[PDB]
Design a protein around this motif. Structure first.
Motif, mmCIF file in Angstrom:
data_model
loop_
_atom_site.group_PDB
_atom_site.id
_atom_site.type_symbol
_atom_site.label_atom_id
_atom_site.label_comp_id
_atom_site.label_asym_id
_atom_site.label_seq_id
_atom_site.Cartn_x
_atom_site.Cartn_y
_atom_site.Cartn_z
ATOM 1 N N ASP A 57 -20.142 22.182 5.356
ATOM 2 C CA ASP A 57 -21.155 21.147 5.287
ATOM 3 C C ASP A 57 -22.442 21.762 4.760
ATOM 4 N N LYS A 96 -28.857 20.639 10.532
ATOM 5 C CA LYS A 96 -28.304 20.345 11.848
ATOM 6 C C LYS A 96 -28.712 21.397 12.868
ATOM 7 N N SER A 115 -26.347 14.492 14.913
ATOM 8 C CA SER A 115 -25.157 13.939 14.280
ATOM 9 C C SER A 115 -25.507 13.194 13.003
ATOM 10 N N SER A 118 -26.504 13.950 8.134
ATOM 11 C CA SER A 118 -25.326 14.293 7.360
ATOM 12 C C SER A 118 -25.589 14.322 5.871
#
Lengths: 49, 49
Positions: free
Chosen positions: B3, B9, B38, B41
């Protein structure tokens, strides 16, 4: 058989999106049909915990 | 992980763990500091701070 109703067939000069709406109904036009979808909001947006 | 927003994050979960003691500035007033890590992203949610 009324050409003044069925304008769009008998008039090559007429654009297809032309209605004579306060006078004649014309029984025939271009119509749209859609494909949208109506989902529930709790199935669209999620909560993080 | 693969990611790309994993460092964002890593910063934001400490921010959420911390919030109430040390404050940081954000870009707007809509998303406060206590937004869960969360949701971060996409790259466009990365804070200017």
């Amino acid at each position: 058989i009324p050409v003044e109703r069925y304008n769009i067939l008998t008039n090559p000069d007429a654009p297809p999106t032309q209605i004579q709406l306060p006078e004649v109904v014309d029984l025939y036009n271009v119509v749209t049909r859609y494909a949208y979808e109506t989902p529930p909001i709790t199935a669209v947006v999620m909560g993080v915990p | 992980t693969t990611d790309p927003c994993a460092p964002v994050k890593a910063f934001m979960t400490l921010a959420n763990m911390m919030v109430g003691f040390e404050t940081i500035p954000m870009d707007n007033q809509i998303y406060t500091q206590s937004r869960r890590a969360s949701a971060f992203s996409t790259p466009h949610t990365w804070p200017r701070c």
